[PDB]
Amino acid sequence: NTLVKQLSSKFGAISSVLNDIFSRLDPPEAEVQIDRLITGRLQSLQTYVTQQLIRAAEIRASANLAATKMSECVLGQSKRVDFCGKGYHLMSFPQSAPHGVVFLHVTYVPAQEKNFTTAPAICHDGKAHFPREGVFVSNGTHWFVTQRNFYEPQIITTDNTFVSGNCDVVIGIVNNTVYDPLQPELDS
Amino acid sequence: ISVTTEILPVSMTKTSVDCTMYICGDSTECSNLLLQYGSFCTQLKRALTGIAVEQDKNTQEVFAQVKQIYKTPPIKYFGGFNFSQILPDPSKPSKRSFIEDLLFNKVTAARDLICAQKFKGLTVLPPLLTDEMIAQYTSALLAGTITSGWTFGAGAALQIPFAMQMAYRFNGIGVTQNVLYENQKLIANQFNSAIGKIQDSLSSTASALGKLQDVVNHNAQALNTLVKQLSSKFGAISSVLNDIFSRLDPPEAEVQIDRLITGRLQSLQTYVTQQLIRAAEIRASANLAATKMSECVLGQSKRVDFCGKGYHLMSFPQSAPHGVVFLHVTYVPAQEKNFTTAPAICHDGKAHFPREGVFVSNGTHWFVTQRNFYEPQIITTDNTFVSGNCDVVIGIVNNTVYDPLQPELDS
Amino acid sequence: NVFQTRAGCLIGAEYVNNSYECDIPIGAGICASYQTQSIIAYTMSLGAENSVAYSNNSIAIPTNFT
Ligand SMILES: *[C@@H]1O[C@H](CO)[C@@H](O[C@@H]2O[C@H](CO)[C@@H](O)[C@H](O)[C@H]2NC(C)=O)[C@H](O)[C@H]1NC(C)=O
Ligand SMILES: *[C@@H]1O[C@H](CO)[C@@H](O[C@@H]2O[C@H](CO)[C@@H](O)[C@H](O)[C@H]2NC(C)=O)[C@H](O)[C@H]1NC(C)=O
Ligand SMILES: *[C@@H]1O[C@H](CO)[C@@H](O[C@@H]2O[C@H](CO)[C@@H](O)[C@H](O)[C@H]2NC(C)=O)[C@H](O)[C@H]1NC(C)=O
Ligand SMILES: *[C@@H]1O[C@H](CO)[C@@H](O[C@@H]2O[C@H](CO)[C@@H](O)[C@H](O)[C@H]2NC(C)=O)[C@H](O)[C@H]1NC(C)=O
Ligand SMILES: *[C@@H]1O[C@H](CO)[C@@H](O[C@@H]2O[C@H](CO)[C@@H](O)[C@H](O)[C@H]2NC(C)=O)[C@H](O)[C@H]1NC(C)=O
Ligand SMILES: *[C@@H]1O[C@H](CO)[C@@H](O[C@@H]2O[C@H](CO)[C@@H](O)[C@H](O)[C@H]2NC(C)=O)[C@H](O)[C@H]1NC(C)=O
Ligand SMILES: *[C@@H]1O[C@H](CO)[C@@H](O[C@@H]2O[C@H](CO)[C@@H](O)[C@H](O)[C@H]2NC(C)=O)[C@H](O)[C@H]1NC(C)=O
Ligand SMILES: *[C@@H]1O[C@H](CO)[C@@H](O)[C@H](O)[C@H]1NC(C)=O
Ligand SMILES: *[C@@H]1O[C@H](CO)[C@@H](O)[C@H](O)[C@H]1NC(C)=O
């Protein structure tokens, strides 16, 4: 619209149209006015082209980002934080829109938290025990092992713990019992 | 344990230009003559306003990522780690930290240049967010990462002791937790020494903030050349237009005025185009900084050479004039030793492959060890699995495997 | 009325001591909005204020998902 509206400028000439300039002045003198008009219009069109180029570069950057998002979020599962949504990414769906794409992100969010008391290791039979893929918790009386992102208490055993060293070097260790699931069937 | 510093520019300086004062000065005749060229200044105002709002959008996107403002509890024990230099200092009125103060002091009758440029139609607008608000965002992020961990980037903040968080990160990089639980004091001392070295380097070295200084210098040079362009004839008798009007008749004064107007308009166009290109580059840098903040501060990244040189552990943000600074805490091995290995163990006519580690030998015996730390253990059936006979694998060796059940059968 | 901000002088808006999310950005941490039947200029509120209970031996574990 502004490129169209620039056509009414005079640029210092005697008129904004060419036919009256050519129908009122001799060839020796109309040249200056024609040159002024031509130079002004050329400058306007060049400025338009430059701005279009810059905007095209920005659109290209956005398109590259969208292509990367389609490659990772949709065709696979992403471990990147805050890339395919807020939370823990599960999956995604694409939809089309005029000059654009819309991504629907299905994600997982925890809720209904609860407090607990924990210790890093358990000292038993003069040895320190560490969890394999969980965390030690206590409800005030007993001790359990639970997964990090969901509450699922379990009994401490040998199958879900591993031993390394004595229990006089780790800060915060506590005393408890580790249940051996081989002897009770052997003694029965 | 290594700490590394990274500097990223975020935003630019917002500028506004007055056409009439810059071009025609205080002369009314030029003001009347200027109207003939049409709409050449509304476009300039639109472009400059777009850049100005873009800068605020950049800052808001980079820094405003937490819904709630957290505070550290009064007790300052975090398993031996100090953190007293990066946390807010209530004594100073700016509510900033030591490193932040050093960074701000690092980058910097008679009439000031700012007033002289203002008196020619070039003005600077203030940003939406003051420095105090950016400091509060940084403090909230630091408190959230110290107290909660990475849980506050995907939901509610759940408290966890610092030692257990470090154990989880060690498990993430590929080392078991017992290493941390047995070398807590050494790791804490290394971290404190690294922070002290960063302090010393910041206090002594004064060339670590090149990028922001380059941005400031480029803006200053652009303004300087724009101002200097006002004293060129462009082919007329003189730069000053009142002398042109007084000396000679209107018929040629019109030509001289047209020459000056065209030259000044061309200079303004060039300035606007260069500003647009620079703003695009700054926006790209801001997008990179926002991605880095979301990926290295609110979580742990497995990408190589992204959140530091080495094995990534964690990171901390700090503010800087028109930019952000990242402190990356990473893990690097040292004191390596040679060993002899084999791909599998042939025992009882069966091939045995390790479950997590690698097989090593110290000259006479054979052990299984984790990949990134030397911790030998006896080869048993608990850390090994069997697949096929031992006449196919190239390089298999002979040894014995211990079964933890037969000893109990006889005892 | 008259108010003096680091971005200049504001006429026609009344300053209040509360804090809301920004609607029209003026600058230097000052925003404006149309509320109450009047125009009010205020200071931005970054967000809600929170504190987390931290100790040697306390953890928080979720029990449900969304
Ligand atoms: C902590 O957890 C233990 C394990 O469930 C609880 O002990 C059980 O409590 C229920 C409650 O009625 C009893 O029916 C069971 O017989 C208990 N089992 C054992 C082995 O004692 C214990 O009550 C929990 N503590 C608290 C304070 O809730
Ligand atoms: C776990 O049990 C051990 C004993 O098996 C406790 O060690 C004792 O500590 C007391 C101090 O309160 C000493 O007087 C005893 O001599 C220690 N016993 C031995 C065999 O050395 C240990 O304190 C217990 N853990 C906790 C947290 O109390
Ligand atoms: C954490 O760091 C601060 C500052 O580096 C330590 O404070 C220094 O303590 C020593 C002796 O304890 C004094 O000689 C220095 O004058 C102190 N410096 C400052 C700036 O206060 C502090 O001891 C470190 N440890 C803890 C637990 O805070
Ligand atoms: C592992 O073995 C290699 C090869 O035997 C060692 O590399 C040589 O080290 C000696 C020093 O004892 C040098 O004089 C040689 O020039 C090295 N050879 C090459 C090709 O560089 C290597 O040092 C051993 N690893 C360790 C930790 O000592
Ligand atoms: C390789 O490691 C073995 C460990 O099994 C070393 O053997 C031990 O050597 C010490 C010598 O100080 C003896 O006291 C131990 O009794 C040995 N262990 C066993 C199980 O007998 C061995 O010295 C190491 N080096 C070589 C070259 O084999
Ligand atoms: C590993 O032990 C096996 C045990 O069967 C070896 O296999 C035999 O080794 C003897 C001694 O050289 C040969 O005479 C037999 O012919 C081998 N049997 C077969 C079926 O090939 C095996 O050689 C040992 N590994 C190595 C590297 O010697
Ligand atoms: C997790 O949350 C869901 C809803 O968000 C709970 O499902 C509801 O539970 C209540 C109380 O048991 C029932 O009255 C409703 O009928 C359930 N369904 C809905 C749609 O509300 C679910 O119980 C929660 N998990 C646990 C373990 O309590
Ligand atoms: C855990 O204890 C703190 C201590 O005040 C409390 O603020 C918080 O609400 C508790 N968590 C839950 C889930 O009740
Ligand atoms: C427990 O916390 C207190 C502060 O609340 C601290 O002084 C003490 O050192 C902590 N204990 C351990 C074992 O870290």
Residue numbers in the entry:
A (entry chain A): 960 to 1147
B (entry chain B): 720 to 827, 845 to 1147
C (entry chain A): 641 to 676, 690 to 719
Mind quoting what the paper says about this structure?
As the spike glycoprotein of SARS-CoV-2 mediates the virus entry into host cells, it is the main target of NAbs and the hotspot for designing therapeutic agents and vaccines. The Omicron spike has 37 mutation sites, 11 located on the N-terminal domain (NTD), 15 on the RBD, and the remaining 11 near the furin cleavage site and on the S2 subunit.
Its overall organization is similar to the prototype and other VOCs. The subunit with the up-RBD was designated Protomer_A, and the other two subunits with the down-RBD were defined as Protomer_B and Protomer_C in a counterclockwise direction.
